[PDB]
């Protein structure tokens, strides 16, 4: 099949500046009929993709002329003359020259803003939950930028592994920040074995790692 490779995987952009995204196909997209059926789509979270550019360079109806497409054979480029807030989401290249039709893996355009450190919060498990035989410990990283963040769980100074899961919000449309939750899950039997529960957060916005903790009880 014709593999389509997109770069970069992520593109933080500041509104007003130009942007450019690349798509390479593992074989020529020039059809025997002379046309090149390479298209560009933009998808927003929770929605279907929407067509921006067809056959390399033709703007789909309604698409503003700040978008353009170029390239030939195997190498293709989508460009935005000056980025606007509305341009955010996942860009996919698409080929319909060769069956099976294929797609690139996507390039995510997000808003670049100044670095913002997370506000960190820890939540002990509730009495209610404990009664049912399980303990969830939640660590919240609120309103930070950029998305890269490290959360480590320490239980009585010991590093935890394989017992936590992380979840992340979509970039806030108004303040351009992310928020993140990390949830440590233990049996009630395992939770009452230890005292100190600690969430350690590493982020570009913080001078050094920040730790919130509680002692089981108090």
């Amino acid at each position: 099949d014709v593999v389509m490779t997109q770069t970069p995987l992520s593109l933080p952009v500041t509104p007003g500046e130009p942007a450019s995204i690349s798509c390479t196909s593992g074989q020529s997209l020039v059809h025997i009929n002379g046309n090149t059926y390479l298209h560009w789509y933009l998808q927003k979270p929770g929605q279907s993709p929407k067509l921006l550019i067809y056959k390399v360079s033709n703007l789909f109806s309604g698409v503003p002329d700040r978008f353009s497409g170029s390239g030939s054979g195997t190498d293709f480029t989508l460009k935005i003359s000056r980025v606007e807030a509305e341009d955010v989401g996942v860009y996919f290249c698409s080929q319909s020259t060769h069956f099976p039709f294929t797609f690139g893996q996507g390039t995510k355009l997000e808003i670049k803003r100044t670095v913002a450190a997370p506000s960190v919060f820890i939540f002990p498990p509730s009495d209610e939950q404990l009664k049912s035989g399980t303990a969830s410990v939640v660590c919240l990283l609120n309103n930070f930028y950029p998305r890269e963040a490290k959360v480590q769980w320490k239980v009585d100074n010991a590093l935890q592994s394989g017992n936590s899961q992380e979840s992340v919000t979509e970039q806030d449309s108004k303040d351009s920040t992310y928020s993140l939750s990390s949830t440590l899950t233990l049996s009630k039997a395992d939770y009452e074995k230890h005292k100190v529960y600690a969430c350690e957060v590493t982020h570009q916005g913080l001078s050094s790692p920040v730790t919130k903790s509680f002692n089981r009880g108090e």
Binding site: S48, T102, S126, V138
Partner: protein, 219 residues
């Protein structure tokens, strides 16, 4: 305006089959080129195949041949996708789309169905438990609700019956090793309000007819 309407969300067990529909509205269904494309968890687009209802023409992604069967009913203007021997990894949003006409036609369409969410799992319907994420420290405090151990997706969470939206973050669900989902919803509020203002998260899980209001208070 041409529209494509797909059948409702499906929950299936491993090994079962499904058949989902894509209903067209407009004359000329027989000349359509209908494609099916699925999309995995915030992931890439996987092309399944294309069908022309006016002829025997079909083309299938080889990777799904003999799981997938595309068909069309010209009398009802409906296209169908059948998928046999479903696996957990077949969990995805399934779209039908009309994008192209015949080569040389000059036709570029961008008609997409609303998508059919398909969940494949051995799990049984179960409503969530809802636990408070209590605030503690005058600046701003965070609080929330942990919505644990439900199936299938989705749940909805509002605060104070939708009266509070500002500063709320409702995280995507994660699938636990038990096969049940879990999510948290948090809000940041003024510290000074904590003594006076009530905070209740309202959790609705339609697939189980579950409605839970959980009051979140300090201590």
């Amino acid at each position: 305006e041409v529209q494509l309407v797909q059948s409702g969300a499906e929950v299936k067990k491993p090994g079962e089959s499904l058949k989902i529909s894509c209903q067209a509205f407009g004359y000329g269904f027989i000349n359509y080129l209908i494609e099916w494309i699925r999309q995995m968890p915030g992931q890439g687009l996987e092309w399944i195949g294309l069908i022309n209802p006016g002829s025997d023409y079909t083309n299938y992604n080889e990777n799904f041949k003999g799981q997938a069967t595309l068909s069309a009913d010209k009398s009802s203007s409906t296209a169908y996708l059948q998928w046999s021997s479903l696996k957990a990894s077949d969990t995805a949003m399934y779209f039908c789309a009309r994008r192209f006409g015949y080569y040389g036609s000059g036709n570029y369409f961008d008609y997409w169905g609303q998508g059919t969410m398909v969940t494949v799992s051995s799990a049984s319907t179960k409503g969530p438990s809802v636990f408070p994420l209590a605030p503690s420290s005058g600046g701003t405090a965070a609080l929330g609700c942990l919505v644990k151990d439900y199936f299938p997706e989705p749940v909805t969470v509002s605060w104070n019956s939708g009266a509070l939206t500002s500063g709320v973050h409702t995280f995507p669900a994660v699938l636990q090793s038990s096969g049940l989902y879990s999510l948290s919803s948090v809000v940041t509020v003024p510290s000074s309000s904590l003594g006076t203002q009530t905070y209740i998260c309202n959790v609705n899980h339609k697939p189980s007819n579950t409605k839970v209001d959980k009051r979140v208070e300090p201590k």
